[PDB]
Amino acid sequence: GRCTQAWPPICFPD
């Protein structure tokens, strides 16, 4: 679910 607003494009599985 969690994710990064800025780069790099890092998105978590949650």
Side-chain angles (χ1 to χ4, degrees):
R2 201 143 152 171
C3 209
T4 42
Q5 305 284 115
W7 266 26
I10 311 301
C11 229
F12 265 62
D14 160 88

